[PDB]
Amino acid sequence: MAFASLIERQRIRLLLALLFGACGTLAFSPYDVWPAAIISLMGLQALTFNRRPLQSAAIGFCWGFGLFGSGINWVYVSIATFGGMPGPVNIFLVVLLAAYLSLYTGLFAGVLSRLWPKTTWLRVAIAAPALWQVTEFLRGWVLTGFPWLQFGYSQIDGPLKGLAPIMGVEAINFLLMMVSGLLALALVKRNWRPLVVAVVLFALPFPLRYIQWFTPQPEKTIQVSMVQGDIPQSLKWDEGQLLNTLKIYYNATAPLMGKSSLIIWPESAITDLEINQQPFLKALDGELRDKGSSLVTGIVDARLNKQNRYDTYNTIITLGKGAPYSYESADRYNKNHLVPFGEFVPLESILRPLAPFFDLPMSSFSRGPYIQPPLSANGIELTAAICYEIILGEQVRDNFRPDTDYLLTISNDAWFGKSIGPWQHFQMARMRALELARPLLRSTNNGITAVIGPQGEIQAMIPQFTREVLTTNVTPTTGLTPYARTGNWPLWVLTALFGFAAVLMSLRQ
Ligand SMILES: CCCCCCCC/C=C\CCCCCCCC(=O)O[C@H](COC(=O)CCCCCCCCCCCCCCC)COP(=O)(O)OCCN
Ligand SMILES: CCCCCCCC/C=C\CCCCCCCC(=O)O[C@H](COC(=O)CCCCCCCCCCCCCCC)COP(=O)(O)OCCN
Ligand SMILES: CCCCCCCCCCCCO[C@@H]1O[C@H](CO)[C@@H](O[C@H]2O[C@H](CO)[C@@H](O)[C@H](O)[C@H]2O)[C@H](O)[C@H]1O
Ligand SMILES: *C(=S)NCCCCCCCCCCCCC
Ligand SMILES: [Cl-]
Ligand SMILES: [Cl-]
Fold this sequence. Notes:
Elements: H1 2-7, H2 10-25, H3 35-47, H4 53-71, H5 75-83, H6 87-115, H7 121-141, H8 164-167, H9 169-189, H10 192-203, E1 215-216, E2 222-228, H11 233-236, H12 242-253, E3 262-264, E4 270-273, H13 278-291, E5 294-304, E6 310-320, E7 332-334, H14 348-351, E8 375-377, E9 380-386, H15 393-399, E10 406-411, H16 421-436, E11 440-444, E12 449-452, E13 458-462, E14 468-474, E15 477-478, H17 482-486, H18 489-508
Parallel strand pairs: 2-3, 3-5, 4-5, 9-10, 10-11
Antiparallel strand pairs: 1-15, 2-14, 5-6, 6-7, 8-9, 11-12, 12-13
Helix pairs in contact: 2-3, 2-4, 3-9, 4-6, 5-6, 6-7, 7-9, 7-18, 9-10
This protein binds ligand 6OU (2 copies), dodecyl-beta-D-maltoside, ~{N}-tridecylmethanethioamide (QGT) and chloride ion (2 copies).
PDB class: transferase
Keywords: Lnt, apolipoprotein N-acyltransferase, Bacterial lipoproteins., transferase
Assembly: monomeric
């Protein structure tokens, strides 16, 4: 009829795809409508049916663009307040970045139509997840890639959460793409066949959330303090800011010495080269050890290399009891994955001059090793990720050890203001504690500071944009989750036989 004829128009499909792409942003924090992920995915899968391959790529691009345009546009805040560029280019960069991520969604759309053009059950439950896995993997890897807004993260409190400990968050990406597809097939074909699968598949891993892969150790229960310094970003790296920042963090810590055994300061909390603060660090360490407490804090460290040059690192150092401070101490962590433009400039010979966005304070850094040992503090192992690194689930898992007591992440999210970015970031961190079944301590400058439980639950948190310290009791856990023993080669073999089956079929006809 006419309604169908309207739906059939391409321009109508492009507009619908925008709304369905943007709808997905609603799935992540702070909104947390986990069904919005299924709605948004259904739109992407259904809206591409019955189209030429290049036609479908354009729909997918718009769906990605709707999702990335609505979901990661908060980047604009950090570009506007500190980027020092005119209005139009600022939004041009934000749209450019969204367009770049949209190519990966669009590419998914386009190859799916070419090889599986018939709207079949094979196309949407067997080719799409595997191809999504590949394209989404590619988005996260290319050019030191950005894997933001994966729908599996929206399932942290939803029914599929019992699945991450076994196979990781990308398995939830895989199933969500698959179950959302059978629903799309049911509608368009008005067939109850995909519907009866989609709900069993969806509900089958609901009992998984009840498996407790870990055993808690209340003997080792400790009082932990995390201090939210709330240093404004505009002043953080100002040289006149240092004394005040040191006073803020020191004054907050000294009364907790002897009460909290672990005290944590956030990323690059000490805004000075480690070698320039030896008297402070040494006296602080002595004071801590006398009271029985240990301190873990971020700091910048320029260190001489084999070729007589200096690599500056974004680093965590430990001090105090059972973690004595020394510049020669090995009890430290150097950030490995660096945020583009924020910590390094891609073409400095040409890009550093252009604008104060391409020259930001402390934006030349070197990378630490991909694998580093735990921070040891008074007998507690700490597996550490700095700021952004916590969203890289495979990397955290590879640094994870069986004797790890807590996951640790310290971050400065003051760039993004009061946007939804810090919440998306905070939500993804929660997935790591669920995947590995250990509590997570998150210390931030003004961003979401919290303790996350072994099942991904929130144990305690403090409000944003305030200068206070979170002190609570936290208890470590032991045992290894399936995902902790494997990484995600198994989802990849599933991706592999699924992908193989599909290519053979699209090769039969
Ligand atoms: C049926 C028809 C439906 C049509 C399709 C719907 C498409 C959906 C459209 C949009 C999706 C949402 C996009 C939000 C837009 C970005 C947010 C925004 O409006 O701006 C910002 C406002 O955004 C907000 O909503 C404020 C956020 C308040 C934070 C407090 C919320 C608490 C969240 C709790 C999270 C739950 C805990 C779990 C987390 C692990 C303004 O902030 P700014 O820093 O002053 O400057 C912003 C400049 N960019
Ligand atoms: C032509 C489209 C075919 C659609 C279906 C084909 C899907 C099958 C393709 C590749 C199967 C991958 C083979 C399994 C390898 C398992 C080994 C393994 O676990 O290594 C993993 C990492 O290494 C990899 O898996 C690499 C993934 C290979 C991607 C395939 C490259 C495709 C190149 C362009 C594809 C464009 C689509 C087709 C073009 C016509 C484990 O680490 P991680 O979890 O990825 O960490 C994340 C790092 N950012
Ligand atoms: C229609 C779809 C179009 C797709 C979009 C087009 C973008 C084209 C650019 C492709 C260039 C690829 O260049 C890309 O560079 C970076 C390094 O700089 C590589 O990645 C490098 O950093 C990553 C970060 O994890 C390391 O883990 C990796 O081992 C390393 O080699 C990418 O793996 C490489 O492939
Ligand atoms: C701690 S700093 N949190 C990090 C978030 C800022 C990310 C914005 C990075 C822009 C990605 C550019 C890379 C585009 C893919 C190559
Ligand atoms: Cl069919
Ligand atoms: Cl000691």
